[PDB]
Design an enzyme around this catalytic site. Sequence first.
Site, short mmCIF file in Angstrom:
data_model
loop_
_atom_site.label_atom_id
_atom_site.label_comp_id
_atom_site.label_asym_id
_atom_site.label_seq_id
_atom_site.Cartn_x
_atom_site.Cartn_y
_atom_site.Cartn_z
N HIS A 204 84.02 37.73 -35.86
CA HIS A 204 85.32 38.40 -35.80
C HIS A 204 85.76 38.85 -37.18
O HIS A 204 85.83 38.05 -38.12
CB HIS A 204 86.37 37.47 -35.19
CG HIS A 204 87.66 38.15 -34.91
ND1 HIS A 204 88.01 38.59 -33.65
CD2 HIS A 204 88.68 38.52 -35.73
CE1 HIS A 204 89.19 39.18 -33.70
NE2 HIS A 204 89.62 39.14 -34.95
N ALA A 205 86.08 40.14 -37.30
CA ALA A 205 86.30 40.74 -38.61
C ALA A 205 87.51 40.15 -39.33
O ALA A 205 88.56 39.94 -38.72
CB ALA A 205 86.49 42.26 -38.47
N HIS B 174 91.25 49.00 -41.33
CA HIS B 174 92.21 47.92 -41.17
C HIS B 174 91.95 46.82 -42.20
O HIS B 174 92.87 46.37 -42.90
CB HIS B 174 92.13 47.36 -39.75
CG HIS B 174 93.02 46.18 -39.53
ND1 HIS B 174 94.32 46.30 -39.08
CD2 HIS B 174 92.82 44.86 -39.74
CE1 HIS B 174 94.87 45.11 -39.00
NE2 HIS B 174 93.98 44.21 -39.40
N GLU B 175 90.70 46.37 -42.30
CA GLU B 175 90.38 45.25 -43.18
C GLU B 175 90.49 45.65 -44.64
O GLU B 175 90.90 44.83 -45.48
CB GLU B 175 88.98 44.73 -42.87
CG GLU B 175 88.81 44.24 -41.44
CD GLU B 175 89.68 43.04 -41.10
OE1 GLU B 175 90.12 42.32 -42.03
OE2 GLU B 175 89.93 42.81 -39.89
N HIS C 253 93.96 45.15 -45.86
CA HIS C 253 94.20 43.78 -46.30
C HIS C 253 93.71 43.59 -47.74
O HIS C 253 94.41 43.01 -48.57
CB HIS C 253 93.48 42.80 -45.39
CG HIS C 253 94.13 42.58 -44.06
ND1 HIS C 253 95.46 42.27 -43.92
CD2 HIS C 253 93.59 42.57 -42.82
CE1 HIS C 253 95.72 42.09 -42.63
NE2 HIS C 253 94.61 42.27 -41.94
N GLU D 190 99.36 43.73 -41.85
CA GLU D 190 98.53 44.33 -40.82
C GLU D 190 98.63 45.86 -40.81
O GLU D 190 97.71 46.51 -40.30
CB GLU D 190 98.94 43.78 -39.45
CG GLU D 190 98.79 42.28 -39.33
CD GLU D 190 97.39 41.80 -39.65
OE1 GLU D 190 96.44 42.57 -39.40
OE2 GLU D 190 97.25 40.67 -40.16
N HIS E 88 92.37 34.81 -31.29
CA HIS E 88 93.50 34.27 -32.04
C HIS E 88 94.04 32.98 -31.46
O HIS E 88 94.75 32.26 -32.17
CB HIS E 88 94.61 35.32 -32.11
CG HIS E 88 94.15 36.60 -32.72
ND1 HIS E 88 93.21 37.41 -32.12
CD2 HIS E 88 94.45 37.18 -33.91
CE1 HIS E 88 92.98 38.45 -32.90
NE2 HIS E 88 93.71 38.33 -33.99
N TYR F 249 100.98 41.91 -34.97
CA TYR F 249 100.32 43.15 -34.59
C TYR F 249 101.26 44.06 -33.80
O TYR F 249 101.14 45.29 -33.89
CB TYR F 249 99.05 42.87 -33.80
CG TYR F 249 98.04 42.00 -34.53
CD1 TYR F 249 97.39 42.46 -35.67
CD2 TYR F 249 97.73 40.73 -34.07
CE1 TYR F 249 96.47 41.68 -36.33
CE2 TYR F 249 96.82 39.94 -34.72
CZ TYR F 249 96.19 40.42 -35.85
OH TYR F 249 95.27 39.67 -36.53
C1 LIG Z 1 91.37 46.48 -36.00
C2 LIG Z 1 91.21 45.05 -36.51
C3 LIG Z 1 90.39 44.17 -35.56
C4 LIG Z 1 90.06 42.82 -36.20
C5 LIG Z 1 91.30 42.00 -36.60
N1 LIG Z 1 90.87 40.78 -37.26
C6 LIG Z 1 92.00 40.00 -37.73
C7 LIG Z 1 91.53 38.67 -38.34
C8 LIG Z 1 92.72 37.75 -38.63
C9 LIG Z 1 92.40 36.34 -39.15
C10 LIG Z 1 93.40 35.64 -39.82
C11 LIG Z 1 93.16 34.36 -40.29
C12 LIG Z 1 91.92 33.77 -40.10
C13 LIG Z 1 90.92 34.46 -39.43
C14 LIG Z 1 91.16 35.74 -38.96
C15 LIG Z 1 92.79 40.77 -38.79
O1 LIG Z 1 92.20 41.29 -39.77
O2 LIG Z 1 94.04 40.87 -38.63
C16 LIG Z 1 92.08 41.67 -35.33
O3 LIG Z 1 91.94 40.63 -34.76
N2 LIG Z 1 93.01 42.64 -34.83
C17 LIG Z 1 93.73 42.29 -33.63
C18 LIG Z 1 94.83 43.31 -33.34
C19 LIG Z 1 94.52 44.76 -33.68
C20 LIG Z 1 93.93 45.60 -32.74
C21 LIG Z 1 93.68 46.92 -33.06
C22 LIG Z 1 94.02 47.39 -34.32
O4 LIG Z 1 93.77 48.72 -34.66
C23 LIG Z 1 94.62 46.56 -35.25
C24 LIG Z 1 94.87 45.24 -34.92
C25 LIG Z 1 92.77 42.23 -32.43
O5 LIG Z 1 91.62 42.75 -32.49
O6 LIG Z 1 93.14 41.65 -31.37
ZN LIG Z 2 94.57 42.33 -39.94
#
Ligand SMILES: CCCC[C@H](N[C@@H](CCc1ccccc1)C(=O)O)C(=O)N[C@@H](Cc1ccc(O)cc1)C(=O)O
Ligand SMILES: [Zn+2]
Length: 578
Positions: A314-315, A344-345, A348, A372, A474, A484
């Site tokens: 998971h990214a 997105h990343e 951050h 975010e 999550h 989000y």
């Molecule tokens: C596009 C990004 C996908 C990956 C992203 N990954 C987390 C890890 C967070 C984390 C925090 C602490 C410890 C470990 C991980 C993060 O970067 O926020 C994520 O989950 N986005 C949500 C929500 C989402 C969905 C589509 C989007 O365009 C933007 C957000 C989803 O996919 O449901």
């Molecule tokens: Zn994020």
Amino acid sequence: DEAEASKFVEEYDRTSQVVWNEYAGANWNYNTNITTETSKILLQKNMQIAQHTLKYGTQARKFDVNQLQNTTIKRIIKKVQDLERAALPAQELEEYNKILLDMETTYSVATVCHPQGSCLQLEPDLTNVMATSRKYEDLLWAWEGWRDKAGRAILQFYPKYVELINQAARLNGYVDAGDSWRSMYETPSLEQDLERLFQELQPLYLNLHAYVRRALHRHYGAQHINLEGPIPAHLLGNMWAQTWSNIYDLVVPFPSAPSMDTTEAMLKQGWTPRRMFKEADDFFTSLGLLPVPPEFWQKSMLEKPTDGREVVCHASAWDFYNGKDFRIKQCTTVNLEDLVVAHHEMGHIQYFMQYKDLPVALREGANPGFHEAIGDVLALSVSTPKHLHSLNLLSSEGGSDEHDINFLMKMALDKIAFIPFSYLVDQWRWRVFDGSITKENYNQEWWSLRLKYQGLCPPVPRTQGDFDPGAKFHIPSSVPYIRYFVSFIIQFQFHEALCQAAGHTGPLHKCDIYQSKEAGQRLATAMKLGFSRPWPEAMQLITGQPQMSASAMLSYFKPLLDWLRTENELHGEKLGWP
Ligand SMILES: CCCC[C@H](N[C@@H](CCc1ccccc1)C(=O)O)C(=O)N[C@@H](Cc1ccc(O)cc1)C(=O)O
Ligand SMILES: [Zn+2]
Ligand SMILES: *[C@@H]1O[C@H](CO[C@@H]2O[C@@H](C)[C@@H](O)[C@@H](O)[C@@H]2O)[C@@H](O[C@@H]2O[C@H](CO)[C@@H](O[C@@H]3O[C@H](CO)[C@@H](O)[C@H](O[C@H]4O[C@H](CO)[C@@H](O)[C@H](O)[C@@H]4O)[C@@H]3O)[C@H](O)[C@H]2NC(C)=O)[C@H](O)[C@H]1NC(C)=O
Ligand SMILES: *[C@@H]1O[C@H](CO)[C@@H](O)[C@H](O)[C@H]1NC(C)=O
Ligand SMILES: [Cl-]
Ligand SMILES: [Cl-]
């Protein structure tokens, strides 16, 4: 008196940098190499950072914050008085850390297997099935199988997790863990504010829902789609039905205006994960923002390893708290969806670099939604036909009205469909934490909210022992979700303000901020504040006013709302569901 408090925050900053950097390294090593050994080291480092948190939090609580004059030192000390899990007694802390590790490992190694056949992982195998299969029963196998393997396996942990995270919250002055999470926004009106924003998006969501429901009826058959009911949750192109853009082919408004296959274009042209992150880096620097350091390219994990290692795919983006070491960990697939994830990343990472000279206690976004939103703002411009054409991923720039509505539909399937999903996840969790939902009805209340807010139903009746929330990253990883929802609202406010700063005229959805130094300057000034000021100040720096508002998102999508209303009217749709 003021002197002791200033010295204390200086000592906290110095020691926190060292300890948090050591913890981040152990956490990275486990996330990128799941083994017995890295698990043990991580759990040991959990105890080390808790010892530090307890030492400084205990001191911090001896300051009467009411008597301190400097507001920045007041703010830092108040934050350090929150020990989070380090407030737990040693036995319960050990148990909590082990539960969290077990939950995240269980999610990240779960597989779904055919009998005497192959076994599929979530990324990329099951994600690809949900995105591309158009056979009801194959989608159902993947949807149900993932919940049977990942969700059901998290249930044994979740009640004890809830007990311990709530216990820690109470030991830090909150009523429950949901209360502590909401407090991160420093907005007493948060729940009412978010409800009002959700209500403003209902015209758009209800009209999109009815239009997609009609298209699914056309493809999957009248016997499987009720035109006055909820949509079966496995048909939307995504494991959680949280974004719907992968079923664009089934719902194209103007099929006479065909769209290029962006995945085949990326593959045909030799795109790689490294190329995707280089393009994101170029967008940030085109705005005058900071490039990622050379260290980022050496230490990041931008594709799934092939040397046998198990990883958390998971990214995610990582700050190592030394002002130099920032990394992304993503099992990148070459497609347009993951290009958006890469931006997105990288947003951050940009925020980490912008606030790196603040004391670590203030190294957060103005609120979690701000963190975010940064990358998503840039990705709105990346997604325009103008920019995709410049990447050779779309054949023209799309002047026609037909191409225009097609583009807005593609964007709505991600951005509008996500609004109710992102609202409901923590509506559910907040009620788990406050005790309104117990383990007796975890799953029933999840599906009540999936119905109420998203208008979705499970394709297979759920049974005792199902724990479908556990099949969403999550939940077992204990990452808050309302960030989000906030992000998807404010990213359009930011887009609108940055497009104005850039001199864009005409419809908001045609704006592309690439290379605008005026747009970058707005973002940089706000990101450099970190968590040093109430978030309305960063909102006013970017947008000229201090509130969250859905009006920018509504303006972006106004032409599509008009088109959807006309289309749904002439088909006689009954918006909503029972
Ligand atoms: C596009 C990004 C996908 C990956 C992203 N990954 C987390 C890890 C967070 C984390 C925090 C602490 C410890 C470990 C991980 C993060 O970067 O926020 C994520 O989950 N986005 C949500 C929500 C989402 C969905 C589509 C989007 O365009 C933007 C957000 C989803 O996919 O449901
Ligand atoms: Zn994020
Ligand atoms: C309340 O206290 C905060 C915090 O003070 C800081 O932390 C304490 C624990 C203690 O260690 C203090 O000694 C320490 O300063 C005060 O906020 C800080 O205020 C100073 C001065 O206003 C800021 O200093 C700036 O640091 C920047 C680092 O990059 C630097 O670039 C800035 O330069 C600016 O000015 C120069 C000269 O004109 C100019 O050349 C630059 O271009 C730029 O304009 C400047 O030196 C800190 O950044 C502040 N820190 C934080 C976290 O906000 C605060 O002032 C105080 N409140 C009151 C009312 O006094
Ligand atoms: C994975 O972890 C083990 C145990 O710590 C270690 O010996 C090994 O070198 C690691 N592998 C990689 C590729 O880092
Ligand atoms: Cl679900
Ligand atoms: Cl949050």
